From a paper:
Glucose-6-phosphate dehydrogenase (G6PD) catalyzes the first and rate-limiting reaction in the PPP; the oxidation of glucose-6-phosphate (G6P) to 6-phosphogluconolactone with concomitant reduction of nicotinamide adenine dinucleotide phosphate (NADP+) to NADPH. G6PD is a major source of cellular NADPH and has a primary role in controlling the metabolic flux through the PPP. G6PD is catalytically active as a homodimer or homotetramer. Each monomer has one G6P binding site (i.e., the catalytic site) and can bind two NADP+ molecules; one is close to the G6P binding site, and the other is the structural NADP+ binding site.
To test the hypothesis that K95/97 ubiquitylation is affected by K89 acetylation-dependent structural changes, we determined the crystal structure of K89-acetylated G6PD. AcK89 G6PD was crystallized in the F222 space group with one protein molecule and structural NADP+ within the asymmetric unit, and the structure was solved to a resolution of 2.46 Å (statistics of data collection and model refinement are listed in Supplementary Table 3). Similarly, the dimeric structures of AcK89 (obtained by symmetry operations) and WT G6PD were essentially identical (Cα RMSD value of 0.35 Å). In contrast, notable local conformational changes were found around residue AcK89, which was rotated by ~180° relative to non-acetylated K89. This conformational change resulted in the partial unwinding of helix αb’ and rotation of residues E94–K97 by ~45° relative to the helix axis. Thus, according to the crystal structure of AcK89, ubiquitylation of K95/97 may be promoted by K89 acetylation-dependent local conformational changes. Next, we introduced K95R, K97R, or K95/97R mutations into pWT and AcK89 G6PD and verified that these mutations have no effect on Vmax. Mutation of either K95 or K97 to arginine reduced the level of AcK89 G6PD ubiquitylation considerably, showing that K89 acetylation promotes the ubiquitylation of G6PD on residues K95/97. According to the measured kinetic parameters, AcK386, AcK408, AcK432, and AcK497 G6PD had 30–70% lower enzymatic efficiency (Kcatapp/KMapp) compared to WT G6PD, AcK403 displayed significantly lower activity, and AcK89 G6PD displayed similar Kcatapp/KMapp for G6P, but 2-fold higher catalytic efficiency for NADP+. Residue K89 is not part of the active site or other functionally important elements, yet, it is highly conserved from E. coli to mammals.
Author numbering:
A (entry chain N), B (entry chain N): 28 to 511
Amino acid sequence: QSDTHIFIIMGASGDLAKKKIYPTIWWLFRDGLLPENTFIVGYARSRLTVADIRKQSEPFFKATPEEKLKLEDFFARNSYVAGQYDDAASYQRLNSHMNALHLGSQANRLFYLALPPTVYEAVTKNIHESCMSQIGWNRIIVEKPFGRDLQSSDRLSNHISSLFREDQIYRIDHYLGKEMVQNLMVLRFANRIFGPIWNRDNIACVILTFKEPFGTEGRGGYFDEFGIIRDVMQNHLLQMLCLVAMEKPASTNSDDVRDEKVKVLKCISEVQANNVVLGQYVGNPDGEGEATKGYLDDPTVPRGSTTATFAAVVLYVENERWDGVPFILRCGKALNERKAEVRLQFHDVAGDIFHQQCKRNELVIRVQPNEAVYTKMMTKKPGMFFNPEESELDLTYGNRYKNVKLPDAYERLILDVFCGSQMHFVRSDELREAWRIFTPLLHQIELEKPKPIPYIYGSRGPTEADELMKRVGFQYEGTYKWVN
Amino acid sequence: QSDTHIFIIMGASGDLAKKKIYPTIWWLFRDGLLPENTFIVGYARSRLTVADIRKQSEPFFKATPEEKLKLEDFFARNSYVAGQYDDAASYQRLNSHMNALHLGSQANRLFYLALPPTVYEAVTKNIHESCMSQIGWNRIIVEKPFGRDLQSSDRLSNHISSLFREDQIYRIDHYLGKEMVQNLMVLRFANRIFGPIWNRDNIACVILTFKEPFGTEGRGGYFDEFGIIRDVMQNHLLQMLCLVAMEKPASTNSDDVRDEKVKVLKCISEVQANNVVLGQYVGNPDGEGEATKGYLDDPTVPRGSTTATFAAVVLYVENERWDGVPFILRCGKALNERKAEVRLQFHDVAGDIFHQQCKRNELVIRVQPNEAVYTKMMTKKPGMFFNPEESELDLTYGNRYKNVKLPDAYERLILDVFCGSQMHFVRSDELREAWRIFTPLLHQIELEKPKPIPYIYGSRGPTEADELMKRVGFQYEGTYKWVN
Ligand SMILES: NC(=O)c1ccc[n+]([C@@H]2O[C@H](COP(=O)([O-])OP(=O)(O)OC[C@H]3O[C@@H](n4cnc5c(N)ncnc54)[C@H](OP(=O)(O)O)[C@@H]3O)[C@@H](O)[C@H]2O)c1
Ligand SMILES: NC(=O)c1ccc[n+]([C@@H]2O[C@H](COP(=O)([O-])OP(=O)(O)OC[C@H]3O[C@@H](n4cnc5c(N)ncnc54)[C@H](OP(=O)(O)O)[C@@H]3O)[C@@H](O)[C@H]2O)c1
């Protein structure tokens, strides 16, 4: 558009703004993806100047000697306004400043809330009362945490919704912005090969995985407040579940897609402790650097802490497509690898004519690292053999899509907020559903404080997780050898 | 087994025996696949000796300096008997010779008929009356041609069946012996991912392909007698159709599999000339060697010959699984490439939510060259794109199964004849069905002698073939770019 656009970084002083948001909008700017008439305004308490932000931020850019773009053009379109987060005059200074930009009164306004959540109500209120364009649209971008249980999430959401329409709320889950997570819809609904099999007649279980090989790395005090399931499971993994489980939406329109995701969530009952295994990492006596230290060997972590760093959990979607099909959600810190992944384990072929030599098919979408889709499969053993054996059909983006830059999540999503696309952004009802499922578990843990199961830095986590997966009907072999 | 085995090469003097069969049984011998107590007897008119066969044949072996195996051991187990193909005494000499081998009277007998078909009745009769073990099994291996129309195929089959049980008849189609052709059953019936889609609700058409880039190469007189459809279409391609179309058999047992193949064939009506395009190659004025010469520029080919070197033909299987689904059979000589292939083109996804940007899925099993299975597919365009585009999931045996020797068809099949496995061998009823489908077409051509459509050496054949495929509902794009 020819419309002017104002991207306000609320909290421009802090680390997220310095190392993520300023770089991200830079890169968007750099690549000709923003509107031409775009201005960046930072707002934080410190008495900063555009020079002080350039010095903070441009070591985090792709600083290249082609920097006319960077040359003030990007920074010339930057300004800064100092201000307190619940001082009304401050927001008049801000609004007034925005107004004095080129067509500032007309411009579309996009407020990035790069702030801690203890200030989200104040900032939000103040924006509403004093800083809203009266002509252009007004969009707010909010980061996790969105509450820490139902009731607290409800507080925040009822506040925001009183001030802003759903039209205006862009809650980011950086997961919706990943290449492979966006691909799920295309994989499923642009292809007949998948789809007729995408149901309980064919699938024995869905595994949704998120693994990190690093522990907590000095920041354990921060993590200890919420733990792994609040961290990763109620947001990222449950999102993947939704995209997997979704009925086909009426259209790609943002709210036809999101009302399929909530629809699924509504068929999932509160998770019971029968279906949970919790883990906390201890260090490896035979390890290297950080890997020697357990969760409790952070001096930032309170002594006797019970917080879990690993959780496997089994959910069920009580509907026609999925009745009975366990959805295993599996995540953790200080594990054997970095990986996030969707796997379908299909049922045994009916009426076996090979002689218990078949192995269940699997469909694997590996979100990270090394973006790949493959199906684990049966072929006839190459050569003089009459036997089936395990093989696969592969799409690996590394090799096929060799010269294709994949954007970072924040590049994609922030672009979506300019283009007005809420598809990849957690809706209010979605967020309620998410909290409903996990809240009574969460409180059970807070109350009764169960000892999580010990596992070694770099292991696959507690063995009890595997027994849970096996008990709901996952089958692990030993037999699938991959090469290349 | 410890049982003695006698492999008789009827026609040991000729080129097939010299360059295929002697080498093939050698290689089997060499690799420890035959029984220990195996003897090879050659039978032909010429007054030859084992020395004369060694000199003929061992340039066609993998002559390696590890040749104890070759050292007479292989040749020490060779003998030769001269004889006429309908002289009774000759078959007494032969039978008597077999008898004087170690446990020759007990031994299992396996007669390879490496002879021209003008002698198949004589040889067969003579074997039956004078050369059958009375203790061990007796198996005959017969090569195409099996007749040239129904009535002629019936003659031969009624002859053979009067003498031999079906138990005893191993009609070779070297196609059933290829790696990928054997794989079809495993691909289909060892995997849930395929299979629920393996039907008319999901498939728009099946393409069965067999292409050669060489013309006729001086041997056109031989080819001119039968033409392309007798050559390739009624055997190899119709076999692939059967393996594709087959209901799931009750067991891998040889005759539960073959009675699925005939079952399909029985739902296919005689092909009409509406559904046929015929081609004959002319040479390329802008070509290289042989490729400059048209079919008629062989002096071996009779002037004004009408024989077709290319044929596309559309068949239908009138049953529950396949009603309406065209099965396009496409083959030819002097084409753009060597290839044999199975392709399923799936229907459009129902209720499109992308915007006519989807392309039909395809499942490709490439039998030769470069044994591969892949599915052509839709993924989201990598990067900042919301669009689907064409991609694929690949199994390429070249890369995955890098160090795996694939045997030649004749190695596999002849081994099957020792192990007593008829699965990969054309049954009598099958062969009747095959002739029924094509015979009235064949005779129509013999009678009315239509001018085949000209196409250039190295082209994809006549463009009218593409119009036929498009008219029955194949859709070709232009858009699928593969790399690697
Ligand atoms: N080009 C490519 O991208 C490509 C294609 C095909 C295969 N590969 C590689 O080949 C390897 C094997 O493939 P795969 O992971 O799909 O097959 P796999 O080894 O069969 O993994 C199956 C799953 O079993 C789980 N599991 C449950 N109970 C288990 C137990 N008791 N013991 C062990 N594992 C148990 C594993 O958890 P974990 O997640 O904790 O292991 C894993 O998710 C991987 O490293 C993969 O990256 C790469
Ligand atoms: N690793 C691997 O093995 C691997 C994997 C994927 C792709 N590839 C390669 O990628 C290339 C493209 O793949 P593909 O052949 O499956 O896709 P394609 O180019 O879409 O071929 C589709 C089919 O369209 C037929 N056709 C019908 N009407 C046509 C018309 N008017 N113009 C052109 N073609 C028409 C072609 O006949 P023809 O058979 O005469 O061409 C062919 O069978 C191939 O060379 C393939 O070997 C290799």
